[PDB]
Symmetry: C3
Subunit: 114 residues, 3 copies
């Protein structure tokens, strides 16, 4: 899976460890091995949410499978809780787009996974 976070919080506010904690927390939550988790954090972005420029985040989680109604609620609880606790971004200024990717549409290692 891959998790991307874009945020107007500044770089010096993302705590050491934050990527490694999202890696291990996502491997538990998705049940995928940690070796296939990628995390990407992009601070200091020019963003607005609900018309204001208070701290906010736009995120994406792509996974082959493990995407659905209850699971994505669970991911939002986990990921909005870490973005509030670690980055101090209120949950109601976070969006997370979830994508259930087909294996034939994810390249890795020179081939795809179908």
């Amino acid at each position: 899976p891959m998790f991307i976070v874009n945020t107007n919080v500044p770089r010096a506010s993302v705590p050491e460890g934050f990527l490694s904690e999202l890696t291990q927390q996502l491997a538990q939550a998705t049940g995928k091995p940690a070796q296939y988790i990628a995390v990407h954090v992009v601070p200091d972005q020019l963003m607005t949410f609900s018309g204001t420029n208070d701290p906010c985040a736009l995120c994406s989680l792509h996974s082959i499978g493990k995407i659905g109604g209850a699971q994505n609620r669970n991911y939002s609880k986990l990921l909005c809780g870490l973005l509030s606790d670690r980055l101090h971004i209120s949950p109601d200024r976070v969006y997370i787009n979830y994508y259930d990717m087909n294996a034939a549409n994810v390249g890795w290692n020179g081939s795809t996974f179908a």
Copy 2:
């Protein structure tokens, strides 16, 4: 809805107010209130279009519903018009990918819209 613009136009060429103009022009054309609209603008990118590095932009609009061929041509004329009057990017060097998100695949506020 969430609108993202990535462009090779430099930061200082992106005028103040441009994220509020896209917020209020999206809430009028999508019909969704500004509370739900997030906008993210990323200047100074390394990007080419048709092979050349004149001004260009790659953008995405994600929304739960309100996405279709004729709606998307309305959004394309309004957003290409703001990118050409504000950022002076030619409309034929702009791509906008539109995504109709299922509510269960959008997280917000620690849960999801399903």
Copy 3:
């Protein structure tokens, strides 16, 4: 078509000429003009793969058609080979998500392709 690469390799490590190369190699592999190809490379990113900060990349290829089993396998050989020879990223630390876009969902020149 549009190809985006996000990677933690530094900007000075990207060959000057790498976007032109990717334009021309994605016009020979998708079979599409280089006028409608857009390429975007984002170095120096905060990202991890398998929980370590060794060189990695998260990419996307979007195209109207030309996207499917065989073609995605071919693009994964071509583009994993390019990022390993040019940016020295190991193919097992690259993800490429492939998106077959409906023509009605791609805006360009103030309209959509359908």
